[PDB]
């Protein structure tokens, strides 16, 4: 017997304490390596977060398959978009600092 629903729940809490720890950490030292881990933690927690909203409200099977696929596509596009911003542009950290000094 495999326990998959329990590990998924534990996974949700692990990324949460990270995302909690990372927001002051990113303020403390806003480096490049922080930008990527910040992008990865945001996108996962958001994917699992909306993942619940889907399983809570999306009724039946017809829309269930579509909504879990549409969320995945969005997430894949989101994480790739942030890495592109970190690699080719100023990065999340510097972007916030610029946006705030405005």
């Amino acid at each position: 017997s495999s326990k998959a629903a329990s590990l998924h729940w534990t996974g949700e809490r692990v990324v949460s304490v990270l995302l909690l720890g990372l927001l002051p950490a990113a303020y403390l030292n806003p480096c490049s390596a922080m930008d990527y881990s910040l992008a990865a933690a945001l996108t996962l927690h958001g994917h699992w977060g909306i993942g619940q909203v889907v399983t809570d409200y999306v009724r039946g099977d017809a829309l269930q398959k579509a909504a879990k696929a549409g969320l995945l596509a969005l997430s894949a596009f989101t994480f790739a978009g942030l890495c592109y911003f970190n690699y080719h542009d100023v990065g999340i950290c510097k972007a916030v600092a610029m946006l705030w000094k405005l």
Partner: protein, 239 residues
């Protein structure tokens, strides 16, 4: 001569496309008992006997008269009427349930969920049962306090929004707390396989700590905390 107004939900399935509507009853409080059930019984006996509802012990022990009084899910024989005459008591059937007639909801699925957790002792060796009393320490007995008292009134599960949206697949606080009751009963041997029955996204994990359950429990119990205790056990147990 003190008069109190009661706004009660009504429906008759034997009235050819009858619409669900509110009906008002006015009652003298001096010739009436303190509790809401005392009022419901009085209007049944004197005003309208078409008012159909569940009742038995009138003691807050059986859990028959569970309904939505003034917003919250409680027992009608336990919640005494607000003496403030300038207010009108609103009585409804238990939230998001199929109405059979008036204040009588369908609890068939509710009970069926309770069957699926197996609320009875399970020993690995049941060949020696019935002979001698199973030993349990005084401290192991205190762990069941707060859990066994549940009368299955279904006030908590009915107050859970997650149980509204997912009544089919989610078990709800009432049943879950009982599944936990048998988890921490030192006499039960099937503690691991009881947890493994919840290894799906719906049975346990639809709880989101909305805490409506504990808030509404007429017995003063804390199902939500017990649900949080299952979640901890589910991630910690090995094999």
């Amino acid at each position: 001569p003190r008069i109190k107004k009661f706004a009660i939900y009504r429906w008759d399935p034997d009235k050819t496309g009858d619409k669900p509507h509110m009906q008002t009853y006015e009652i003298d409080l001096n010739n009436c008992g303190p509790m809401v059930l005392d009022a419901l019984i009085k209007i049944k006996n004197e005003i309208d006997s078409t008012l159909t509802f569940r009742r038995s012990c009138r003691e807050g022990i059986c859990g028959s008269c569970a309904m939505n009084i003034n917003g919250g899910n409680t027992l009608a024989c336990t919640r005494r009427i607000d003496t403030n005459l300038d207010k009108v008591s609103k009585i409804y059937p238990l939230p998001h349930m199929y109405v059979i007639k008036d204040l009588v909801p369908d609890l068939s699925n509710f009970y069926a969920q309770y069957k699926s957790i197996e609320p009875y002792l399970k020993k690995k060796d049941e060949s020696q049962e019935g002979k001698q009393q199973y030993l349990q320490s005084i401290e192991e007995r205190e762990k069941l306090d707060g859990l066994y008292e549940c009368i299955l009134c279904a006030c908590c599960s009915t107050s859970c929004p997650s149980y509204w949206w997912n009544g089919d697949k989610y078990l709800g606080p009432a049943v879950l707390m009982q599944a936990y009751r048998w988890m921490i009963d030192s006499r039960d041997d099937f503690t691991e396989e009881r947890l493994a029955k919840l290894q799906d996204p719906f049975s346990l994990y639809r709880c989101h700590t909305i805490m409506n359950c504990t808030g509404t429990c007429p017995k003063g119990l804390n199902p939500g905390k017990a649900i949080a205790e299952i979640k901890k056990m589910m991630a910690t147990y090995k094999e």
